[PDB]
């Protein structure tokens, strides 16, 4: 089990569901961020009960994990995801 924590003092979190979890600003994102720099469909995290695999969906501004730019990236507990001016912690 894997939870993403939005680090904006809002305290919003989202637990990954098996399969595709879209993260973005758009209306059919599983976890939606009202950050103008975040793409409508910004990244996808595939989850199979063991491995959370992050993928940048060709976003306008990119995605970094732990301050390094990524395309595809297997997440770990404690990783910090940056998109737009937002930050998601993996816990």
């Amino acid at each position: 089990s894997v939870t993403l924590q939005l680090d904006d003092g809002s305290g919003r979190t989202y637990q990954l569901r098996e399969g595709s979890n879209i993260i973005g600003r758009g209306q059919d994102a599983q976890f939606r961020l009202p950050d103008t720099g975040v793409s409508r469909r910004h990244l996808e995290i595939r989850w199979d009960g063991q491995v959370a695999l992050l993928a940048d969906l060709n976003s306008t501004n990119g995605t970094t994990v732990n301050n390094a730019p990524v395309q595809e990236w297997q997440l770990a507990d404690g990783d910090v995801i940056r998109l737009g001016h937002s930050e998601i912690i993996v816990r």
């Binding site: 600003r25 758009g26 209306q27 793409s39 306008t60 501004n61």
Partner: protein, 257 residues
């Protein structure tokens, strides 16, 4: 007795094209002969069937509106009494009628971005203590710079904020699916009446075209229904803004330029 080619207000205006309206009002496109450009004309009660005090109140409230400076309402250039009851002269808005634009099937996001001008004008107007009277499709034009605009100002005594909210909501429904969802009064607009559900209500735009994002459909649907939660033009404006931001293009970030 008002017909194209007619001269109005001592030869100041010549009527060109009739754009409808719900009686007793008539919306006209005319030529300003003295200034050699077009204006919008709203005739209040050309036939004189209203009590004088209703005519009076219409023109008074309409001047109230003229003291607002927002893109979503045309400039009122003049308010006069003529051989045809009251007359409201407004600047002409380059573009097309709400009807003409709806028929082009614009993009949902485009449509709701365009509507903010009207919603924000209603908000301002309501705060100044006056209604816009969005009571008919033909009241509204879309300018070539993309604002939905009250082209034919004329606010009668019975107009109110709540009906503006429905009107503005209906204008959006129109852009979304090319139908008018409120009951049609007076001169037909060219918008076919909306399809309706078993329950009576107009069918939600996302249920007619599932490419319409549900937040955008929602603004139209809730605005238009009677017992629907949306109670101020301010609220309406805000929902539109949010709907728009959810679907807008992404802001670009880069290093300092």
């Amino acid at each position: 007795q008002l017909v194209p080619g007619a001269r109005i207000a001592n030869g100041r205006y010549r009527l060109l094209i009739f754009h409808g309206g719900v009686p007793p009002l008539q919306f006209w496109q005319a030529l300003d002969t003295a200034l050699d450009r077009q204006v919008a004309l709203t005739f209040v009660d050309p036939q004189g069937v209203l009590p004088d005090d209703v005519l009076q109140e219409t023109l008074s409230r309409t001047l109230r509106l003229s003291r607002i400076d927002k893109p979503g309402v045309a400039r009122v250039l003049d308010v006069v009494h003529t051989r045809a009851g009251g007359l409201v002269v407004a600047e002409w808005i380059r573009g097309g009628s709400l009807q003409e634009v709806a028929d082009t099937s614009p993009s949902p996001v485009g449509a709701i971005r365009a509507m903010q001008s009207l919603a924000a004008a209603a908000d301002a107007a309501h705060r100044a203590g006056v209604a816009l009277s969005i009571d008919h499709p033909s009241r509204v034009r879309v300018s070539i710079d993309g604002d939905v605009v009250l082209a034919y100002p004329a606010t009668m005594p019975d107009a109110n904020p709540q009906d503006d909210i429905r009107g503005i909501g209906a204008s959006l429904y129109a852009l979304l699916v090319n139908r008018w969802p409120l009951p049609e009064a007076g001169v037909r607009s060219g918008l076919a009446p909306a399809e309706r559900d078993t329950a009576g209500q107009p069918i939600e735009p996302a249920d007619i075209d599932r490419d319409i994002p549900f937040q955008i459909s929602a603004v139209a649907a809730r605005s238009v229904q009677g017992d629907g939660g949306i109670r101020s033009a301010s609220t309406l404006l805000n929902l539109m803004q949010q709907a728009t931001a959810v679907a807008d293009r992404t802001e670009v970030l880069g290093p300092i330029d």
